[PDB]
Design a protein around this ligand. Structure first.
Ligand SMILES: CCCCCCCC/C=C/CCCCCCCC(=O)OC[C@@H](O)CO
Ligand SMILES: CCCCCCCC/C=C/CCCCCCCC(=O)OC[C@@H](O)CO
Ligand SMILES: CCCCCCCC/C=C/CCCCCCCC(=O)OC[C@H](O)CO
Ligand SMILES: CCCCCCCC/C=C\CCCCCCCC(=O)OC[C@H](O)CO
Ligand SMILES: CCCCCCCCCCCCCCCC(=O)O
Ligand SMILES: CCCCCCCCCCCCCCCC(=O)O
Ligand SMILES: [Cl-]
Ligand SMILES: [Mg+2]
Length: 490
């Protein structure tokens, strides 16, 4: 009974509608919850003053991020080792910082398009949501966690991703959710019909196969989930058992699996420190028909008498003879704030933004370390037409035993769909899996086990429209909409 037009009631409902958006992502996977969450954001800001709207947008974000990324508590607790209330204080600060961008979006949309109208809801909102979400993923190196439409990896809109990227699905979901909110508030059937047509049109695109599989190039791949406990991983006494654990798991696979993979920083020692182990392993792998890629840390002495420490992937074995001077390697480019460096200016150095694909046993792998797999444009920029598989290695203990590793895993799936390549995901303990060229999960082992995933995987060829272009077609769309919306407010 009309309680909705009290500002404090709008703030509370925004928290609920924002929290509802968390159900859209893995492991919950209720993709309609993304539309309901966006409907609340669009509707709760109708007929509000700009700062009233910004507060509602902030509270929507606080429910979304407060419920969606509170697993970073485990990251902070594992990193800092401080009492609980201290880590809660930092988590609330994180969710509050990210909610500035959802409040930015609501405040500006209310300031420039105050009226409840199709223009505000279907033209201005998706274009401005694209800008404010870019800023969230760019400012201070950014944190673009939780974009709806990553929830469409198994949904009716998935065919959009190979054409224009996952951000196109962010764009369309906001558009459709606005017109549903518009139809509800104005009690009008026309915006609902347009919303249904807009939602339904991209459905036949999921029956498009942009890739060409190569069945006779199929190889057996093994991914060693060593499951080193995080409290022990970097202890100096653990190093010798870690190398034992991984070598013993790999020995029965040599000569059977063409490609063997160890996860991020599996060898918890400097690369210069392990030349005896690496050289011996390389020869045994070459003598059998096998190849190995593994994570490690590299403190490399540079031209100016100093060491740049990297989070790196190295290659060994058949078709990739190991050498400390070999260019057949990958250095992490996008480091994690506080975890791997500090925003001010022992830290990690960054590899180049674009690095060549890894080569191993005649296989070409486009690599990204952990978090980097969510950087869709960056993964696309490193992709090459001759890339056979996408590769990501990660240590998802930093994501908790919670929803964290599943949200990370979900977004890695989008890379395979966007580029029409199989994705090899090797992790220390959290969701090791092979993803097919359409985002489907071909093989997977349970978390928190010490075992290896061995299966057949088939490489693909072909270029999706998104692999050809990248983000610029969507950007010219938000520019055309932004130009039109700004002029329409004449
Ligand atoms: C003529 C050439 C155009 C080239 C550019 C085209 C770019 C794509 C444009 C798509 C626009 C989609 C707009 C969708 C707009 C929906 C408006 C609506 O539902 O209004 C309901 C009210 O009327 C009820 O009273
Ligand atoms: C605050 C005022 C009102 C704003 C309304 C929304 C305006 C949106 C317009 C933005 C224009 C930005 C144009 C930026 C164009 C850059 C193109 C680009 O970066 O392409 C991607 C590359 O990776 C290549 O693939
Ligand atoms: C003082 C200035 C403050 C600037 C603040 C910048 C805002 C963005 C911060 C995001 C932190 C996100 C932390 C999320 C934890 C991810 C950890 C991770 O991905 O690590 C996996 C892998 O093991 C590692 O290589
Ligand atoms: C308002 C400004 C923005 C708000 C800022 C407040 C948030 C700070 C919270 C946690 C920092 C601790 C980060 C811990 C990151 C996880 C550790 C990690 O990822 O380690 C990587 C690995 O150890 C090496 O490869
Ligand atoms: C179609 C579903 C509609 C559901 C509407 C009510 C949503 C309430 C649930 C909010 C999400 C809470 C998730 C908490 C998980 C977490 O914080 O770890
Ligand atoms: C702040 C005053 C101008 C505001 C104009 C709004 C549109 C420009 C805002 C900057 C975001 C554009 C970033 C593009 C980056 C890229 O395309 O890769
Ligand atoms: Cl680690
Ligand atoms: Mg080539």
């Amino acid at each position: 009974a009309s309680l909705i037009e009290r500002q404090r009631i709008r703030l509370l409902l925004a928290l609920l509608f924002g929290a509802c958006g968390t159900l859209a992502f893995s492991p919950y996977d209720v993709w309609p919850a993304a539309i309901i969450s966006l409907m609340g954001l669009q509707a709760l800001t109708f007929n509000r003053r700009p700062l009233q709207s910004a507060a509602i947008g902030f509270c929507w974000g606080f429910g979304l991020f407060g419920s969606g990324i509170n697993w970073v508590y485990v990251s902070i607790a594992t990193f800092g080792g401080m009492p609980g209330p201290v880590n809660i204080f930092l988590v609330v600060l994180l969710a509050a910082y990210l909610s500035l961008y959802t409040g930015l979006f609501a405040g500006v949309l209310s300031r420039l398009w105050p009226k409840t109208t199709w223009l505000r809801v279907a033209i201005a909102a998706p274009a401005l949501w694209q800008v404010t979400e870019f800023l969230r993923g760019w400012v201070l190196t950014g944190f673009p966690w939780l974009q709806f439409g990553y929830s469409q990896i198994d949904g009716p809109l998935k065919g959009l991703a190979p054409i224009m990227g996952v951000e196109a699905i962010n764009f369309l979901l906001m558009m459709v959710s606005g017109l549903l909110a518009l139809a509800l508030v104005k009690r009008n059937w026309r915006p609902l019909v347009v919303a249904v047509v807009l939602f339904a049109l991209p459905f036949p695109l999921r029956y498009i196969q942009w890739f060409t599989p190569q069945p006779e190039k199929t190889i057996q791949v093994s991914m060693v989930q060593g499951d080193i406990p995080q409290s022990l991983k970097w202890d100096e006494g653990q190093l010798l058992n870690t190398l034992k654990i991984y070598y013993n798991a790999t020995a029965p696979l040599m000569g059977k699996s063409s490609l063997i993979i160890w996860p991020e920083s599996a060898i918890t020692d400097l690369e210069i420190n392990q030349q005896p182990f690496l050289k011996a392993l390389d020869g045994e792998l070459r003598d059998k028909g096998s190849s190995l890629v593994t994570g490690i840390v590299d403190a490399r002495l540079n031209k100016q008498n100093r060491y740049d420490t990297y989070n790196t992937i190295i290659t060994l074995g058949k078709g990739a003879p190991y050498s400390y001077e070999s260019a057949d390697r990958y250095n992490k480019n996008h480091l994690v704030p506080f975890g791997e460096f500090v925003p001010l200016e022992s830290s990690f150095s960054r590899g180049p933004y674009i690095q060549p694909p890894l080569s191993a046993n005649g296989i070409e792998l486009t690599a990204a370390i952990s978090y980097e797999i969510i950087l869709g444009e960056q993964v696309r920029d490193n992709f090459r037409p001759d890339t056979d598989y996408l590769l990501t290695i990660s240590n998802d203990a930093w994501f908790g035993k919670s929803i964290g590793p599943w949200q990370h895993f979900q977004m890695a799936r989008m890379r395979a769909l966007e580029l029409a390549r199989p994705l090899l995901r090797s992790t220390n303990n959290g969701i090791t899996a092979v993803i097919g060229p359409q985002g489907e999960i071909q093989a997977m082992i349970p978390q928190f086990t010490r075992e290896v995933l061995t299966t057949n995987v088939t490489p693909t060829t072909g270029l999706t429209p998104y692999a050809r272009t990248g983000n610029w077609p969507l950007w010219v769309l938000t520019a055309l909409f932004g130009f039109a919306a700004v002029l329409m407010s004449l």
